[PDB]
Design a protein around this motif. Sequence first.
Motif, PDB file in Angstrom:
ATOM      1  N   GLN I 121       0.843  -1.198   0.000  1.00 39.06           N
ATOM      2  CA  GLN I 121       0.000   0.000   0.000  1.00 39.06           C
ATOM      3  C   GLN I 121       0.881   1.252   0.000  1.00 39.06           C
ATOM      4  O   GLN I 121       2.015   1.227   0.532  1.00 39.06           O
ATOM      5  N   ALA I 122       0.364   2.360  -0.514  1.00 38.39           N
ATOM      6  CA  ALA I 122       1.060   3.657  -0.468  1.00 38.39           C
ATOM      7  C   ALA I 122       1.637   3.921   0.934  1.00 38.39           C
ATOM      8  O   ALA I 122       2.780   4.375   1.053  1.00 38.39           O
ATOM      9  N   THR I 123       0.858   3.745   2.004  1.00 35.21           N
ATOM     10  CA  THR I 123       1.351   4.093   3.367  1.00 35.21           C
ATOM     11  C   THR I 123       2.484   3.147   3.761  1.00 35.21           C
ATOM     12  O   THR I 123       3.377   3.605   4.517  1.00 35.21           O
ATOM     13  N   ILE I 125       4.702   1.830   1.636  1.00 33.88           N
ATOM     14  CA  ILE I 125       5.844   2.312   0.831  1.00 33.88           C
ATOM     15  C   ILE I 125       6.423   3.549   1.520  1.00 33.88           C
ATOM     16  O   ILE I 125       7.664   3.699   1.602  1.00 33.88           O
ATOM     17  N   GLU I 126       5.585   4.453   2.023  1.00 36.65           N
ATOM     18  CA  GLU I 126       6.030   5.669   2.721  1.00 36.65           C
ATOM     19  C   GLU I 126       6.843   5.275   3.977  1.00 36.65           C
ATOM     20  O   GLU I 126       7.907   5.886   4.189  1.00 36.65           O
ATOM     21  N   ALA I 129      10.211   3.973   2.792  1.00 34.04           N
ATOM     22  CA  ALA I 129      11.050   5.060   2.267  1.00 34.04           C
ATOM     23  C   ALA I 129      11.615   5.893   3.404  1.00 34.04           C
ATOM     24  O   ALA I 129      12.816   6.224   3.407  1.00 34.04           O
TER      25      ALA I 129
END
Lengths: 182, 185, 182, 182, 186, 185, 182, 182, 182
Positions: I121-123, I125-126, I129
Amino acid sequence: IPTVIAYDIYSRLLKDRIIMLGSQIDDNVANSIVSQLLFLQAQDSEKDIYLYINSPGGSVTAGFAIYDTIQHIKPDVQTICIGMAASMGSFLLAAGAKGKRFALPNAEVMIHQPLGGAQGQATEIEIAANHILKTREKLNRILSERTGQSIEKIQKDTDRDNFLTAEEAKEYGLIDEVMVPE
Amino acid sequence: IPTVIERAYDIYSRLLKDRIIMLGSQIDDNVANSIVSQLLFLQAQDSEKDIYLYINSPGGSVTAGFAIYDTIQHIKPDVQTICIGMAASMGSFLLAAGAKGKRFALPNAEVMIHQPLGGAQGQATEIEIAANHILKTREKLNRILSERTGQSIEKIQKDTDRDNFLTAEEAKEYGLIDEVMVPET
Amino acid sequence: IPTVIAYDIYSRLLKDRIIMLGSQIDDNVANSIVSQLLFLQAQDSEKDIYLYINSPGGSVTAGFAIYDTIQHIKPDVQTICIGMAASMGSFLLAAGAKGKRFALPNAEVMIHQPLGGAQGQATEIEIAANHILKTREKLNRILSERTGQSIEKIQKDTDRDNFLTAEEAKEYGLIDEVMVPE
Amino acid sequence: IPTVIAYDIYSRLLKDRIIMLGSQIDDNVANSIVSQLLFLQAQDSEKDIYLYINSPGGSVTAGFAIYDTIQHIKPDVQTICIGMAASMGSFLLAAGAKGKRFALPNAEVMIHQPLGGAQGQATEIEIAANHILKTREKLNRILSERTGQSIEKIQKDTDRDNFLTAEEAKEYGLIDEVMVPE
Amino acid sequence: IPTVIETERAYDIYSRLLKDRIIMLGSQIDDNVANSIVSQLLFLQAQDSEKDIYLYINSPGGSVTAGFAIYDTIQHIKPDVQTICIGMAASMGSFLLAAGAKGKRFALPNAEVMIHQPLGGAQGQATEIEIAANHILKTREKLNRILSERTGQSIEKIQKDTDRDNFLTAEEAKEYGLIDEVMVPE
Amino acid sequence: IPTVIETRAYDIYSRLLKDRIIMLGSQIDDNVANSIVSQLLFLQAQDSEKDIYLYINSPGGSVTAGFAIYDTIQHIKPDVQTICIGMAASMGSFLLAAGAKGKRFALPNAEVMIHQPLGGAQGQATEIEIAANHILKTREKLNRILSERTGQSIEKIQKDTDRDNFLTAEEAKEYGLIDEVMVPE
Amino acid sequence: IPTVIAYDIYSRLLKDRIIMLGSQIDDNVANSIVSQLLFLQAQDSEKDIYLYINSPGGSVTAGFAIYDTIQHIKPDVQTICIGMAASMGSFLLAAGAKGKRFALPNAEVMIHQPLGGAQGQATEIEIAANHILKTREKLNRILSERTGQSIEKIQKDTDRDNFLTAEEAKEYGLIDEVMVPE
Amino acid sequence: IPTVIAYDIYSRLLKDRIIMLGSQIDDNVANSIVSQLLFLQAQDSEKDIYLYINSPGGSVTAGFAIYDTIQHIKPDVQTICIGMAASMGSFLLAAGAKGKRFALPNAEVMIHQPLGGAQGQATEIEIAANHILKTREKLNRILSERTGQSIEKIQKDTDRDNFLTAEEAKEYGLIDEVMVPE
Amino acid sequence: IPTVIAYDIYSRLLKDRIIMLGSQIDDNVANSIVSQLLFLQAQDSEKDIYLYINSPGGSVTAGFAIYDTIQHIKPDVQTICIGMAASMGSFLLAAGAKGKRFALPNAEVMIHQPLGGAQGQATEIEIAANHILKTREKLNRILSERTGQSIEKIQKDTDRDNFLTAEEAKEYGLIDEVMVPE
Ligand SMILES: C[C@H]1C(=O)N(Cc2cccc3ccccc23)C[C@@H]2N(C(=O)NCc3ccc(F)cc3)CCC(=O)N21
Ligand SMILES: C[C@H]1C(=O)N(Cc2cccc3ccccc23)C[C@@H]2N(C(=O)NCc3ccc(F)cc3)CCC(=O)N21
Ligand SMILES: C[C@H]1C(=O)N(Cc2cccc3ccccc23)C[C@@H]2N(C(=O)NCc3ccc(F)cc3)CCC(=O)N21
Ligand SMILES: C[C@H]1C(=O)N(Cc2cccc3ccccc23)C[C@@H]2N(C(=O)NCc3ccc(F)cc3)CCC(=O)N21
Ligand SMILES: C[C@H]1C(=O)N(Cc2cccc3ccccc23)C[C@@H]2N(C(=O)NCc3ccc(F)cc3)CCC(=O)N21
Ligand SMILES: C[C@H]1C(=O)N(Cc2cccc3ccccc23)C[C@@H]2N(C(=O)NCc3ccc(F)cc3)CCC(=O)N21
Ligand SMILES: C[C@H]1C(=O)N(Cc2cccc3ccccc23)C[C@@H]2N(C(=O)NCc3ccc(F)cc3)CCC(=O)N21
Ligand SMILES: C[C@H]1C(=O)N(Cc2cccc3ccccc23)C[C@@H]2N(C(=O)NCc3ccc(F)cc3)CCC(=O)N21
Ligand SMILES: C[C@H]1C(=O)N(Cc2cccc3ccccc23)C[C@@H]2N(C(=O)NCc3ccc(F)cc3)CCC(=O)N21
Ligand SMILES: C[C@H]1C(=O)N(Cc2cccc3ccccc23)C[C@@H]2N(C(=O)NCc3ccc(F)cc3)CCC(=O)N21
């Protein structure tokens, strides 16, 4: 493989001049058996050696390494088939000292012609065919000598898989006696 | 494969309308069955007019090649053979099988001759049967190649022991073709 | 596969009563050939049919689907071997109308016993063995009828792969004539 | 591999100056045999060493590691073929001390040209071809010196696989004697 | 692949180009591609023996024997065969680009031309490797001799310049003699 | 691998190490280099004056692993003799040439091969540029050292390693990669 | 893919001079697009062509086949980014006729340096590196000409993946207008 | 897929201005739907289009190709969810003409945040993370505009998979009406 | 691995306070090196330890297990690069006792930013990162402290793979001296 006190069980049998041929015959198995035969001759050149055979056979050249070492050394090598001797294993069973080739009563003996293969140019296939036919002639000549059967009979009887009981193997001349239990 | 409209034809079917058959792949039974059918069809359309067999083939099955060879000899029309690209093994055998005087190669075509390939696994007597069969097949191929080239069987045997690559001019000198089709200035 | 104008080349040959048996015999090939035979009989019950054979054989039951359809229909079915007829392909070559079985001069004919396999319990292996032996007896009986050779000779001659030239196949009775080129 | 009392059987043979070449020849096998040869020379520079050969051959450079070590050391290295010596294995059999190269009667010897491969650009294939041709010239020159056969004869006789009996290998000059059983 | 309809006949786009005497060599050269191109060349000669043919080349090359099937068919037929490199012509593709009618070999300005020696392989006995090596060396001699004839460069220079992968711009290919003109956009 | 027992049990390679012989008998990777570096450092500690014998039968391998061995040889006090038996190729031939001056040998039928380094680069144009610059600088470093150890010019080494170059033992001596062919008595 | 009456939907769009670049760019896609461009020029040399771009890019030489064909032909080729234009797809978007390069408002544009690889000898890696660097210089020079940005700015902005909105792509000079909905 | 007389069933629905989004959304599906939308606008710029949605979603950029084409064209595009609309499929359901977004009563709607991946150097992972976060902001902004829900609510409600009934999707503002059966 | 008399060669070096980091750094390698460092501190808390580095790097957390153990213990840990130190291996080379960080003259040192990955999910990946960016900041801060270079310079110089000679690594402050041969 259990230990007895220290020897692994097979090394303990080798101390009593028993060699185990208990697997498919490949170069590694042949090299081991040849080394054991030469070592036992050096320990005592007069006392019998016992070759146990439970083998589906394998490499003909590896089998001839064992065959020629048996004939070379001074001690008699008894052969005993337990379980099964097939193909080159039955050849080695027949190669034991005269009068000292045995099977237990429910052991299976199988004889058949050699197997192989060839791929390539016609002339390469011809070379491979000539070689396997010459190998079969060599095996049949020695089996005729050790069994008392004619080469013509051995050729017919090995055309396809031929299963023998222990008593049939004695009648054929592959062994001298069935070792019957007390 | 493109289509042309004259009737709509794929390009190979359009060449077949002009009595040109393409042997452009490894020779297997499917390729042989197709070429045999085309030869029989063209004979039925016109028993007198030449047929043109294009060969760009690395060879393949000897029996499939003999299906083509025997159909060529059976039918009434002359079958011209032309090697473009390469004719190897059974492909070069079929190039040599064209009508006498009508076997061609273009100048940079490659012709290769060699003995047949095969294999056998099993019992000694099975390997013997397989060996005898491939040796008899090689005798059959060499006898026909001797007849169609004018070379002796002994010479063909020596010259096919290993892969033997010929230029178009060398294939003409050998008797596998009659002429090199040189381009007009 | 090219088109002639519109038919694919094999459909054009079927319009002239030529059926192509040009692959390994499996049920799909047999179903197609059976359908073509029945269609050609319906178009004309008197005119010959031409069965081209370039086949390494295959399924015995699929081959018998073709064999029985040939015998059922009214038209004579000529057989012609081009390239090779092996195993069930050679059986079908021998099954053509009497006097109308041909080979081209460099065609190869091979005869041999049926192949198969069985895995499982002893009784399952026995059922499979009895089935393939009965199938071999069925094939040999019909081949004896169609060639004029004895069942005993066919049994001996099919024990291993037996390759025949077109002339040898004529001498054997598998074909009637070698179709020699003009 | 059994133990004798403690040595594994092969280590016990090495104590009696017997080295086993019983597998395909690769760099690991060569490095081991080279080390054994140098060790046995250090133990006794005068006493013979015995090289047993049951090998299908292998790497030519690994074989030359063994060959050059045999020639370097002071002790005579006897060679004995048991089972089979093929390709670089037969080369090493021929490399034993003059008069001390043996085979047992049913051992197989095979000679043939070296095998290899080349992939890439035309000039890379040319380098690879020139290298394998020069390697074959080197093998043939040494085999000529060790057998008494001409380089021209060795070239012709190794064009394809050439199987020799033990007696044929003696006639060829690959061995000095067939070691016949008492 | 899209269809076009001209009034009515429906064509796949490549068949429509073939109606205007354009042949597409747009893939690796294997025997199937060569057989198709050879058939197209023979068909176009029969349709009109005088009118130019246009051979489009966007190919990484491939089989040398398949390439010589195309080369010899180009030389055999009567019509001039223009060659045009769009995208890339490498290896046997660049050999075919150089084989077009003299004065009618083109590239578009950002097309890539690459020349190099032939690739192959051999495995087996020493004498089999020798036969394979002699064959690929004779093939390279044949390629270089023809490229010398078609470019005006010496065989010695062609041998040196094809020892390794040699990438040429369209203008460099013109300077070399592999093409006659860069087709610059109006 | 056999064992020898002296009245102490050693595997045969460990017994050779007791007599200051190190075996480089495989492809050179980091594990092989770490072992050989440890052996060199141990032998220096046992005896800082006595020669060491480095046996080479190797197709080469990793350039950085080979430089681990090279720099350890130059670092230690004892002379390291090198002897090629079988083959020394690529980084193996570089290490053969790195032995003590006058003590680099080959047996008569040993093969020596020299060629340029191999590698790879994948990614963005700038990443490929970094990888190319690195392998070119590595080649120049190898060639400079080989020039120093053979007496040949860098330009001659560059030309002679462009493709695989096989040398006999006598050719390797003429080239300056070894000092003597060890001919048998 | 649906049919309209008869055309598949993409062939119906080509009748209205719309070409779909809707996949990864490989030689097959380039050959098709080049053929479509040449056909549309022949049908009408004056009327605009519309190149739809929804592509993640792909082969640089395949992309230059399309680029050079666009510049060669007489009609203006409008470009429109819908979905995404990345890498060689964004290069082709920027290559449309001046004033006729568009994106819809939520389309994504991504620019970055070319990707590749090389394995082999040091000199082979050097040739591969020099070639990809020259290719990047050619791409960046054309993008500088078609955007109005300096070569130095294009080099910096393509060092890593750089995602632009449609409005950012207009500000950059990769497109002329965002096609805003009524 | 059946034919009606001649159209495949989907092509027959397209003749009545019905477009099927019935699979995962990838570029091929988007390119087809975009082409259908543009074709239907050209046939009649005033008559409604019907977009059927039974989709698990898929590529966000492919979905935005569809989204922007819907907003670009003049006809109203009705959306109807039958079976399921998930992820980018639910986004497209919400993108239909205001008042003309429907679901059948047992249809499933699912909303969740976008999925992706990033591999490589720290700075490459940062670029990929910033891109997927900006993409999520873009999706949430548009979904807020089309549903009437806040961006903060959409962010919270899509953190994990959120399944809605048809009636719940109407309450949320993803559709205007549940199409209840007569 | 050879034995000296009895120690394996690496255990014999450990007896003289030499630890070999000669492979990719994973948790198993780190646990072994940590144990060796703690054992050597116990054997003699004052005497130097010698850490040999021939490593392409590996896990950053496994490397920090080694780094923190080096800084924890009382003895000075000398570091010596032989062959190559890359990535976390070059970080550990720079972590040796001040004045006792060495490389041999032909050793290769390479520095670059950390590598990793994230899918989901985007969150998610954040989070991944932000973690790898914080890890890079931690590495750069320590490398600035140990080399004397600014964090800004380290960030620029590690953006891509940066290969240093031994002399360049000394100039940079990653080592104190090149250990030149006598
Ligand atoms: C009976 C006779 C013989 O035929 N064999 C062959 C044989 C080999 C392997 C398994 C067998 C199983 C069943 C029957 C025979 C078997 C070996 C046996 N020997 C012994 O039993 N020796 C005591 C012994 C055995 C094992 C051991 F560890 C220590 C002592 C050597 C002395 C001797 O005459 N014989
Ligand atoms: C007969 C002669 C010889 O040709 N060989 C070669 C040889 C090697 C391997 C297997 C062989 C099998 C069959 C025939 C020869 C074989 C070795 C043998 N040696 C012994 O047998 N030495 C006692 C011994 C052997 C093994 C052992 F463990 C302890 C002592 C060394 C002394 C000697 O002259 N010879
Ligand atoms: C000679 C005879 C025959 O033995 N065959 C068998 C046969 C089958 C397949 C390939 C063969 C190849 C070589 C030789 C025989 C071949 C078919 C042939 N027929 C024709 O040739 N009929 C014209 C025809 C053929 C094809 C076509 F498309 C149109 C007409 C039907 C009429 C007839 O008597 N014959
Ligand atoms: C004899 C009888 C029957 O038992 N069958 C079954 C049958 C099915 C499939 C293959 C068979 C092969 C061999 C023997 C029966 C086969 C169908 C046949 N029919 C026909 O032959 N009808 C002409 C026809 C056939 C095919 C065609 F294409 C056109 C006409 C329908 C009328 C009828 O009574 N029969
Ligand atoms: C002749 C000289 C030399 O060049 N080498 C290199 C060498 C290494 C590996 C294999 C080789 C094979 C053939 C020829 C040289 C070989 C080692 C040898 N050494 C010995 O042989 N030392 C006794 C020894 C060896 C092994 C062992 F176990 C015990 C003692 C050390 C003393 C010495 O001067 N030399
Ligand atoms: C020159 C001669 C010939 O040798 N061939 C063999 C041939 C076959 C395949 C490819 C070839 C390529 C280059 C050279 C020969 C090739 C066929 C040719 N034919 C034609 O060209 N016929 C017009 C034609 C061809 C194709 C087509 F679609 C329509 C008409 C039939 C009439 C004739 O004498 N010839
Ligand atoms: C010179 C200095 C040093 O920098 N190292 C690091 C080092 C580590 C690994 C490989 C290396 C290769 C080349 C150069 C340095 C190498 C260890 C060395 N040590 C010894 O050599 N100690 C004797 C010893 C070594 C090995 C052994 F088994 C017994 C004793 C400890 C005492 C000391 O000051 N040093
Ligand atoms: C300009 C010239 C030429 O160099 N070519 C080669 C060519 C081939 C493939 C793609 C190309 C792309 C860009 C540039 C040239 C390309 C073909 C072209 N031809 C046409 O354009 N003919 C109208 C036409 C084309 C396609 C179509 F479907 C119908 C008509 C034939 C007449 C002619 O002189 N030429
Ligand atoms: C608006 C303008 C334009 O920018 N395009 C590009 C374009 C391409 C692909 C998808 C797009 C989706 C959304 C927006 C633009 C799209 C094509 C369009 N054209 C048409 O719509 N032509 C009627 C038409 C379309 C399809 C069809 F099958 C029949 C007619 C040709 C005439 C023209 O000016 N335009
Ligand atoms: C400092 C304290 C402690 O926190 N640890 C935990 C520890 C565990 C593993 C790795 C570590 C690395 C860095 C720092 C702590 C580590 C163990 C240590 N112990 C020792 O160091 N004991 C001597 C000893 C160690 C190893 C050895 F082999 C012999 C003696 C037991 C007595 C004690 O208080 N401590």
